[PDB]
Ligand binder design. Structure first.
Ligand SMILES: COc1cc2nc(NC(=O)c3csc(COc4ccc(F)cc4)n3)sc2cc1OC
Ligand SMILES: Nc1ncnc2c1c(I)cn2[C@@H]1O[C@H](CO)[C@@H](O)[C@H]1O
Length: 351
């Protein structure tokens, strides 16, 4: 029904009231509201994607995945409010639990103790273990996608770029997909356009760990070649065999033309960090995806030994499946599927 706030309209309510602007997401404003059903404050994502096909893909993907996932380190969807008629629907409001902050903003104001870092990492990898067990790739793990309520309450969010894992799905379309925010993008994405393996999420987590240890991003490239420059500057010039799985024969070039850099020792870059953290970091930031540590091995690393508990780390009941590949569907078809997926939150949804 009613409502406004900062000039924009928020067709939330009567249920949701006492609004209060929060900030900006992708294609939408984001306030907090009071849920008059649940008698607590919640976050409401106002999304306007239907203009561009790509924005509708991401919006669709996030709904399908979050509605199927259930895990305490992964944000849920509590309520989806949209218009009654498909033609009259031009906004979508996604209602989710209200979180105090996210890792990105927290790292702007605080240096994290080893302890706190340790249990943040544990909660990231516990959530990641459920995601990968569902055969799903997040593909955009980074601090602003880690929502935080306390040192003991971390939730992964924003599954807009997620995919079902397809260790074979190749396409080598370097301009055809947006895979990971640049600073957190694994080398095999940039060198082989190989963005459908679980290794890419582990890389990102490694970038997030490095960032927790120093309050700055470890690889802040301006563009993708500068990104590779920052990686080789700490990892050192690659081997022949790491240069073996560089499928793009032209991608070779800017690397071969490089001045042999030495591997910077982790403890030199992070003199104050726990050596156990620095050893796990080493396993996560391996250039070659095939030697990089997997999520269950990361959880079992000695650095997480205080918390690792396979009996309290849920996995998915069944692999997740996109019943249709929506890579190339017109944005009017996607808007249809969105209208459908959000049907369960409308009066009279049968079945
Ligand atoms: C979310 O708000 C809070 C923030 C917060 N930050 C804290 N940091 C320290 O106490 C603290 C004590 S030694 C230290 C330095 O660590 C390292 C480790 C490795 C490295 F390579 C560089 C540095 N850091 S404790 C804390 C509690 C908060 O809420 C209860
Ligand atoms: N559930 C939530 N609780 C708090 N903040 C959230 C969310 C969601 I989902 C997204 N955001 C966005 O991330 C930032 C939080 O610091 C904010 O800028 C906001 O854009």
């Amino acid at each position: 029904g009613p409502e406004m706030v900062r000039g924009q309209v928020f067709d939330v309510g009567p249920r949701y009231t006492n609004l209060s602007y929060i900030g900006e997401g992708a294609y939408g404003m984001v306030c907090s509201a009071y849920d008059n059903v649940n008698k607590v404050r919640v976050a409401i994502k106002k999304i306007s994607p239907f203009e561009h096909q790509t924005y509708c893909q991401r919006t669709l993907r996030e709904i399908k995945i979050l509605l199927r996932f259930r895990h305490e380190n992964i944000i849920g969807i509590n309520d989806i409010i949209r218009a009654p008629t498909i033609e009259q629907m031009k906004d979508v409001y996604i209602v989710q639990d209200l979180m105090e902050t996210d890792l990105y903003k927290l790292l702007k104001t605080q240096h994290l103790s080893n302890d706190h870092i340790c249990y943040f990492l544990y909660q990231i990898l516990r959530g990641l273990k459920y995601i990968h067990s569902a055969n799903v790739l997040h593909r955009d793990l980074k601090p602003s996608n880690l929502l935080l309520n306390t040192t003991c309450d971390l939730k992964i969010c924003d599954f807009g770029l997620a995919r079902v894992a397809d260790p074979d799905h190749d396409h080598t379309g370097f301009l055809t997909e947006y895979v990971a925010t640049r600073w957190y993008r694994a080398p095999e994405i940039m060198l082989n356009s190989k963005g459908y393996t679980k290794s890419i999420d582990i890389w990102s987590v490694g970038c997030i760990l490095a960032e927790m240890l120093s309050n700055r991003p470890i690889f802040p490239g301006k563009h993708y070649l500068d990104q590779l420059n920052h990686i080789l500057g700490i990892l050192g010039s690659p081997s022949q065999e790491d240069l073996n799985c560089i499928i793009n024969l032209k991608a070779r070039n800017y690397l071969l033309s490089l001045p042999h850099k030495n591997k910077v020792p982790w403890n030199r870059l992070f003199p104050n960090a726990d050596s156990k953290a620095l050893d796990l970091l080493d396993k996560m930031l391996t250039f070659n995806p095939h030697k990089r540590i997997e999520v269950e091995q990361a959880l079992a690393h000695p650095y997480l030994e205080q918390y690792y508990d396979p009996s309290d780390e849920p996995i998915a009941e069944a692999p997740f499946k996109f019943d249709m590949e929506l890579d190339d569907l017109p944005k009017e078809k996607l808007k249809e599927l969105i209208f459908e997926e959000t049907a369960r939150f409308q009066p009279g949804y049968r079945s």
